[PDB]
Amino acid sequence: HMLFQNVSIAGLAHIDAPHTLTSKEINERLQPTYDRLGIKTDVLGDVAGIHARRLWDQDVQASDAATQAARKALIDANIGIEKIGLLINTSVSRDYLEPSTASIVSGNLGVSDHCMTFDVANACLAFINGMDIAARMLERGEIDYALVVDGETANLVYEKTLERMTSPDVTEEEFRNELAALTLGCGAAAMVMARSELVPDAPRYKGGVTRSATEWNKLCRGNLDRMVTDTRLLLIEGIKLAQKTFVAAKQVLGWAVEELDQFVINQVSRPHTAAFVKSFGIDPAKVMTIFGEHGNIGPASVPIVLSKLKELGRLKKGDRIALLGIGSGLNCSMAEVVW
Amino acid sequence: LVPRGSHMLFQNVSIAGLAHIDAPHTLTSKEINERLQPTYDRLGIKTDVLGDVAGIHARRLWDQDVQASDAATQAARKALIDANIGIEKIGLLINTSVSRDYLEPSTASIVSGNLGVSDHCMTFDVANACLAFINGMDIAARMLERGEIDYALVVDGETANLVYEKTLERMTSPDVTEEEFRNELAALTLGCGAAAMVMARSELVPDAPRYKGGVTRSATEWNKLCRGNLDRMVTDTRLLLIEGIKLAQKTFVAAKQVLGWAVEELDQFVINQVSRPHTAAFVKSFGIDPAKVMTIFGEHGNIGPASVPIVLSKLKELGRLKKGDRIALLGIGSGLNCSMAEVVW
């Protein structure tokens, strides 16, 4: 109905974590347990389509990775830290329960005393929610520039999920609900959003829609050491929810699939992506994918994909870009960017 | 005569419903002190640091199996009754608690699923230590003002059971050091509780309190002062006090400019509930009459972000609030962050 008209994307950056763990290396470590429990499918490589993921140096915290992404994004926007009025952290990974990881990143950067900070959590949709929050403050004139940051760390989840499941007493069906933890990846991203009158040639964020099906909130449940997931059910219901969200997006954004130049989606696995593409009848050329080599980087995967698109020169002035997230909740958000 | 700007204050946003839940089991500072007494003896501690210095006589706890979502959900049902609306009217639900069931999904999604929100309802969590309920209120108010929703729930359930249990064990260790004992003591001032607020477009609830918003300042160079995980909170209460008050004084200069505030013109100050020295420092630093600052930490401890709406609900329930009262909401949270916002009853 009334879209955002003066919110721009002034800067955008991602960080690839530096250590590679391949699914071949994981599978060798788990072969005993694959054997002594009779499993013959390579679930990571063949079903999920995840061949590697990246991990940080030890003791990199979420705040550290978010800080590194933030600095890059500020250089991409060509602004100093003193112009930032809002810093929102959207990661699943968090240094503490308190304070917010946002305050830590904000302190590492040296934001001013006018800078407002807080964290948003919402599984793989939180970056888009963070963008939407920021847009609302930009539009109203509360701030000129915002940082939305997201660092994800899966190092501990790998150490405990693995070392767990390689021990003498390891059972099953457990296995199928925990191997999903072995699809997770490390990475970070950041974006600088701004009032359009400050950065007139920049991409524009128009906003979007959200629909929910919170009857299914038990399906995917993650802490520091463990993620237990029902992958089948998440997929199917996720897609039904997305179809409903797409009817809303038609109503508020004038969306039809044939007019969108890119779909930037949260990156989960080959079956999640194929089912999305097949259901909606989307040309797969419009859907870049990174999970083969990075796994599932949660809410950072959206901006990481967009930033990769930008750095490869795939995005042209006037491109209509759909940002979308299907996340645990279940929740679905779809938003537009005009490049 | 001279037209001024709104200073970015919210327009046409109201408070339609408000409620709190008190946790059921009382844990007295007398009981805690009896358990800490051999450690006190060994460290030479001769004063009642909980009851006499902090001013906390008791706090409440839930049962061990109560999650943040369960408590929030009970507060939310009460707030919806107070607003006289069904869950179907809610277009936004924000959970603001420090305590959380999981890292994902959001605790707001659990609450929402418990209450049966519709498929139009947007949900997510906000985390910002003791300021987050106000941050949630602001976020919802921006949506309400813009006309995107009619009603929002801001909810907050706090559970301190685990922190109590594990702190008391570490604090009674024969090998605990003075510095660790001092660093962890503040965790024994925490309390359990929950709150929830229904916010609405003012045209739907014409006689309801109005929420104006206000101003925020930060000092994120002090982000190490109070750090907490699921079973441990470490706090430098001396610099939190000093640097908190310094941040508050700065935020209050901004409030004078945007809200027109003067201490003499506010009917109540609703502050996050920390301890007697923090409250005495705040009141003396600003010259506030103590009668206008209701305190619940004496019997409930520090309930984090829920403290602000719990105090507001308890003022409401006591009949301390009258139409036209100018209520200052002031939060100084770990970070450091400070917000000062106005409600006109």
Swiss-Prot record, chain A:
<protein>
    <recommendedName>
        <fullName>Acyl-CoA:acyl-CoA alkyltransferase</fullName>
        <ecNumber>2.3.3.20</ecNumber>
    </recommendedName>
</protein>
<dbReference type="Pfam" id="PF08541">
    <property type="entry name" value="ACP_syn_III_C"/>
</dbReference>
<keyword id="KW-0012">Acyltransferase</keyword>
<dbReference type="InterPro" id="IPR013751">
    <property type="entry name" value="ACP_syn_III_N"/>
</dbReference>
<comment type="similarity">
    <text>Belongs to the thiolase-like superfamily. OleA family.</text>
</comment>
<dbReference type="GO" id="GO:0044550">
    <property type="term" value="P:secondary metabolite biosynthetic process"/>
</dbReference>
<feature type="binding site">
    <location>
        <position position="19"/>
    </location>
    <ligand>
        <name>Mn(2+)</name>
    </ligand>
</feature>
<comment type="function">
    <text>Involved in olefin biosynthesis. Catalyzes a non-decarboxylative head-to-head Claisen condensation of two acyl-CoA molecules, generating an (R)-2-alkyl-3-oxoalkanoate. Is active with fatty acyl-CoA substrates that ranged from C(8) to C(16) in length, and is the most active with palmitoyl-CoA and myristoyl-CoA.</text>
</comment>
<dbReference type="GO" id="GO:0046872">
    <property type="term" value="F:metal ion binding"/>
</dbReference>
<keyword id="KW-0963">Cytoplasm</keyword>
<dbReference type="InterPro" id="IPR013747">
    <property type="entry name" value="ACP_syn_III_C"/>
</dbReference>
<comment type="subunit">
    <text>Homodimer. Weakly associates with the OleBCD complex.</text>
</comment>
<keyword id="KW-0808">Transferase</keyword>
<dbReference type="GO" id="GO:0004315">
    <property type="term" value="F:3-oxoacyl-[acyl-carrier-protein] synthase activity"/>
</dbReference>
<feature type="active site" description="Proton acceptor">
    <location>
        <position position="98"/>
    </location>
</feature>
<feature type="active site" description="Acyl-thioester intermediate">
    <location>
        <position position="124"/>
    </location>
</feature>
<keyword id="KW-0479">Metal-binding</keyword>
<feature type="site" description="Important for activity">
    <location>
        <position position="266"/>
    </location>
</feature>
<dbReference type="InterPro" id="IPR016039">
    <property type="entry name" value="Thiolase-like"/>
</dbReference>
<dbReference type="GO" id="GO:0006633">
    <property type="term" value="P:fatty acid biosynthetic process"/>
</dbReference>
<dbReference type="GO" id="GO:0005737">
    <property type="term" value="C:cytoplasm"/>
</dbReference>
<keyword id="KW-0464">Manganese</keyword>
<feature type="binding site">
    <location>
        <position position="57"/>
    </location>
    <ligand>
        <name>Mn(2+)</name>
    </ligand>
</feature>
<dbReference type="Pfam" id="PF08545">
    <property type="entry name" value="ACP_syn_III"/>
</dbReference>
